[PDB]
Write an enzyme that holds these catalytic residues in place. Sequence first.
Site, PDB file in Angstrom:
ATOM      1  N   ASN A  74       6.922 -16.678  -8.038  1.00 57.03           N
ATOM      2  CA  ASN A  74       6.730 -16.736  -6.595  1.00 57.03           C
ATOM      3  C   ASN A  74       5.496 -17.562  -6.242  1.00 57.03           C
ATOM      4  O   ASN A  74       5.348 -18.025  -5.112  1.00 57.03           O
ATOM      5  CB  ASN A  74       6.593 -15.325  -6.020  1.00 57.03           C
ATOM      6  CG  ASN A  74       7.266 -15.183  -4.668  1.00 57.03           C
ATOM      7  OD1 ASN A  74       6.605 -14.966  -3.652  1.00 57.03           O
ATOM      8  ND2 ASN A  74       8.589 -15.304  -4.651  1.00 57.03           N
ATOM      9  N   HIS A  92       2.521 -16.053 -15.957  1.00 55.26           N
ATOM     10  CA  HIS A  92       3.262 -15.229 -15.008  1.00 55.26           C
ATOM     11  C   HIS A  92       3.429 -13.808 -15.538  1.00 55.26           C
ATOM     12  O   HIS A  92       2.733 -13.395 -16.467  1.00 55.26           O
ATOM     13  CB  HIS A  92       4.632 -15.845 -14.727  1.00 55.26           C
ATOM     14  CG  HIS A  92       4.583 -17.316 -14.453  1.00 55.26           C
ATOM     15  ND1 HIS A  92       4.183 -17.843 -13.243  1.00 55.26           N
ATOM     16  CD2 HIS A  92       4.885 -18.374 -15.241  1.00 55.26           C
ATOM     17  CE1 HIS A  92       4.242 -19.162 -13.298  1.00 55.26           C
ATOM     18  NE2 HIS A  92       4.666 -19.510 -14.501  1.00 55.26           N
ATOM     19  N   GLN A 108      15.867 -21.311 -11.975  1.00 54.67           N
ATOM     20  CA  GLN A 108      15.234 -20.711 -10.806  1.00 54.67           C
ATOM     21  C   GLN A 108      15.961 -19.437 -10.388  1.00 54.67           C
ATOM     22  O   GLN A 108      17.097 -19.196 -10.796  1.00 54.67           O
ATOM     23  CB  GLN A 108      15.213 -21.706  -9.644  1.00 54.67           C
ATOM     24  CG  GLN A 108      14.285 -21.298  -8.511  1.00 54.67           C
ATOM     25  CD  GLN A 108      12.877 -20.999  -8.989  1.00 54.67           C
ATOM     26  OE1 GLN A 108      12.282 -21.781  -9.730  1.00 54.67           O
ATOM     27  NE2 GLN A 108      12.337 -19.863  -8.564  1.00 54.67           N
ATOM     28  N   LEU A 158       3.432 -22.046 -20.736  1.00 58.27           N
ATOM     29  CA  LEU A 158       2.944 -21.178 -19.670  1.00 58.27           C
ATOM     30  C   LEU A 158       1.789 -20.310 -20.161  1.00 58.27           C
ATOM     31  O   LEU A 158       0.702 -20.324 -19.583  1.00 58.27           O
ATOM     32  CB  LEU A 158       4.076 -20.292 -19.149  1.00 58.27           C
ATOM     33  CG  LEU A 158       5.264 -21.022 -18.520  1.00 58.27           C
ATOM     34  CD1 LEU A 158       6.405 -20.053 -18.252  1.00 58.27           C
ATOM     35  CD2 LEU A 158       4.843 -21.719 -17.235  1.00 58.27           C
ATOM     36  N   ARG A 178      17.553 -25.210  -8.395  1.00 56.51           N
ATOM     37  CA  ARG A 178      16.463 -25.672  -9.247  1.00 56.51           C
ATOM     38  C   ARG A 178      16.671 -25.219 -10.689  1.00 56.51           C
ATOM     39  O   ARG A 178      15.980 -24.322 -11.175  1.00 56.51           O
ATOM     40  CB  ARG A 178      15.123 -25.149  -8.725  1.00 56.51           C
ATOM     41  CG  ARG A 178      13.931 -25.586  -9.562  1.00 56.51           C
ATOM     42  CD  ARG A 178      13.359 -26.906  -9.071  1.00 56.51           C
ATOM     43  NE  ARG A 178      14.313 -27.642  -8.245  1.00 56.51           N
ATOM     44  CZ  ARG A 178      14.174 -27.812  -6.935  1.00 56.51           C
ATOM     45  NH1 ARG A 178      13.125 -27.302  -6.305  1.00 56.51           N
ATOM     46  NH2 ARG A 178      15.085 -28.495  -6.253  1.00 56.51           N
ATOM     47  N   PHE A 191      13.857 -26.401 -19.962  1.00 58.72           N
ATOM     48  CA  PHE A 191      12.600 -25.712 -19.691  1.00 58.72           C
ATOM     49  C   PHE A 191      12.855 -24.335 -19.084  1.00 58.72           C
ATOM     50  O   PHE A 191      12.368 -23.323 -19.589  1.00 58.72           O
ATOM     51  CB  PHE A 191      11.732 -26.545 -18.745  1.00 58.72           C
ATOM     52  CG  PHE A 191      10.383 -26.883 -19.312  1.00 58.72           C
ATOM     53  CD1 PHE A 191      10.263 -27.390 -20.596  1.00 58.72           C
ATOM     54  CD2 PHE A 191       9.234 -26.695 -18.561  1.00 58.72           C
ATOM     55  CE1 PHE A 191       9.024 -27.702 -21.121  1.00 58.72           C
ATOM     56  CE2 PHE A 191       7.992 -27.006 -19.080  1.00 58.72           C
ATOM     57  CZ  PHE A 191       7.886 -27.509 -20.362  1.00 58.72           C
ATOM     58  N   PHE A 219      12.812 -17.245 -13.286  1.00 58.54           N
ATOM     59  CA  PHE A 219      13.371 -18.498 -13.782  1.00 58.54           C
ATOM     60  C   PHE A 219      13.924 -18.327 -15.193  1.00 58.54           C
ATOM     61  O   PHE A 219      13.202 -18.486 -16.178  1.00 58.54           O
ATOM     62  CB  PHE A 219      12.305 -19.595 -13.770  1.00 58.54           C
ATOM     63  CG  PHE A 219      10.929 -19.099 -14.110  1.00 58.54           C
ATOM     64  CD1 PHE A 219      10.760 -17.994 -14.930  1.00 58.54           C
ATOM     65  CD2 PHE A 219       9.804 -19.738 -13.612  1.00 58.54           C
ATOM     66  CE1 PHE A 219       9.494 -17.535 -15.244  1.00 58.54           C
ATOM     67  CE2 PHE A 219       8.537 -19.283 -13.923  1.00 58.54           C
ATOM     68  CZ  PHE A 219       8.382 -18.181 -14.741  1.00 58.54           C
TER      69      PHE A 219
END
EC number: 5.2.1.8
Length: 165
Positions: A102, A126, A63, A122, A55, A60, A113
């Site tokens: 997660n 996170h 993963q 974001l 991923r 952007f 990531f």
Amino acid sequence: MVNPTVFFDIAVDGEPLGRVSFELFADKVPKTAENFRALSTGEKGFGYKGSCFHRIIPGFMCQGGDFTRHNGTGGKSIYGEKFEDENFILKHTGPGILSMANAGPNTNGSQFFICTAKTEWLDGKHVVFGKVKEGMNIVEAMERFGSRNGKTSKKITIADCGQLE
């Protein structure tokens, strides 16, 4: 002061790209850092030198790695399902930033990531606890072998990893 650092030999279809470490600010995020550290270090008790990457979004972010009971012999965040919201002292202020994905809310787990670009979209979405230590060239190569959606042709895996200091 001094924060712990760990490397992650990024491989591509068997061919190792090089060296890619991250400076985990355990001083500001010890609860979250201790996780990725205890594992990469092996002190966790078993860890898992391999993981898998499927991923990578060139533009952007990428993963990290997940394992619990999807393939077999999974694990966890060295503390049950996961931990709780710690803090965001280190807000995404550019690329080469490490965090947790997660799940988001009280789920630091270990699904970071590699931030290939200040993810302002974001906004404290996170928990950040790391940053490309050295070998940024590697992170730039992966972006070239990534698809604008997630999946990818090449298979990125971790060959080796451990504390540097």
